[PDB]
């Protein structure tokens, strides 16, 4: 039952992610605006929670929390938990940033992004104003997001999309390729069915989404090269140890 499968994935998503596209979108039409050093200082003063590195550290804190939620979410995808633990780890290593950057779009518009559970809005112009390595780490994610948003997915669509992202059978070093592939196919048949039901007039949505998954893999490939490089060129700036593990040999 593809409808039942769809609904359980969706409820797994609602359970594990507090900020949904529904909540984000309703807010995006009250949050404290962060657009310079001063407003950031204020935001950190209780209102919401060098400049470029500090923003980078805030970014790391948010993505590592999203990795945690994705790890708990994956446990609810049928058959994920029955994979050997080393296969679960490989799947998370390689999929968690593709999922993060897909879900980023839910909290973005052309002008900036919601932070701290909707309490703040950080403007894209401020992020463009940061020093060179950091500024162009962030901008490509905005570019992907505004385009992604034009597909007009909802949270029920996104739940299946992220599930399908995590269960990629072609991740480097996967042990049981055929089992992962089989579970992914189940999610995708569900996703195709759900898009028919949810988006009846949206011709071509499902191949569009499959192409978005390849786009995300290249977004993340390019992201990793940039993070890998900051690790060398930017001697003073720290990387969270879990992120260090994720980018290690990626």
In this structure, what are the phi and psi dihedrals at residue 194, rounded to the nearest 5 degrees?
-65, -40
Task: Give yes or no for residue 122 binding ligand VCA (CB under 6 A).
Answer: yes
With CB under 6 A as the contact rule, which of the stretches 20-28, 53-61, 85-93, 190-198 interacts with ligand VCA?
53-61
| Residue 113 C-beta: closest distance to ligand VCA, Å | 6
In this structure, what are the phi and psi dihedrals at residue 197, rounded to the nearest 5 degrees?
-65, -55
Using an 8 Å Cβ cutoff, are 103 and 162 in contact?
yes
Nearer to its own copies, 172 or 200 (CB): 172
With CB under 8 A as the contact rule, which of the stretches 10-18, 157-165, 170-178, 190-198 interacts with its own copies?
170-178
Nearer to its own copies, 52 or 71 (CB): 71
List residues in the chain that are followed by a break over 2.5 Å (C to N): 29, 49
Q: What does 241 interact with, of its own copies, ligand B7G, ligand VCA, none (CB < 5 to 8 A by kind)?
A: its own copies
Task: Give yes or no for residue 86 binding its own copies (CB under 8 A).
Answer: yes
Task: Give yes or no for residue 60 binding ligand VCA (CB under 6 A).
Answer: yes
Residues that bind ligand VCA (CB under 6 A): 55, 58-60, 62-63, 104, 113, 115, 122, 137-138, 141, 227, 243
């Amino acid at each position: 039952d593809l409808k039942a499968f769809s609904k359980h994935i969706y409820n797994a998503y609602l359970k594990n992610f507090n900020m949904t596209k529904k909540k984000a979108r309703s807010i995006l039409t009250a949050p404290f605006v962060i657009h310079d050093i001063e407003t950031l200082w204020q935001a950190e003063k209780g209102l919401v929670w060098e400049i470029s590195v500090h923003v980078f550290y805030r970014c790391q804190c948010t993505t590592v929390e999203t990795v945690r939620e994705l790890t708990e979410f994956a446990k609810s995808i049928p058959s994920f938990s029955s994979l050997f633990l080393n296969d679960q780890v490989t799947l998370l290593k390689y999929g968690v940033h593709e999922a993060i950057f897909a879900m980023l779009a839910s909290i973005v518009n052309k002008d900036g992004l919601l932070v701290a559970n909707g309490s703040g809005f950080v403007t894209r112009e401020f992020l463009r104003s940061l020093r060179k390595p950091f500024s162009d780490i962030i901008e490509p994610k905005f570019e992907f997001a505004v385009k992604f948003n034009a597909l007009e997915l909802d949270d029920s669509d996104l739940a299946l999309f992220i599930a399908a992202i995590i269960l990629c059978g072609d991740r480097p070093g996967l042990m049981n390729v055929p089992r992962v592939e089989a579970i992914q196919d189940t999610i995708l048949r569900a996703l195709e069915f759900h898009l028919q039901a949810n988006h009846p007039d949206a011709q071509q949505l499902f191949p569009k989404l499959l192409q978005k998954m390849a786009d995300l893999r290249q977004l993340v490939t390019e992201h990793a090269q940039m993070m890998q490089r900051i690790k060398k060129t930017e001697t003073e700036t720290s990387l969270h140890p879990l992120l260090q593990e994720i980018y290690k040999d990626m």
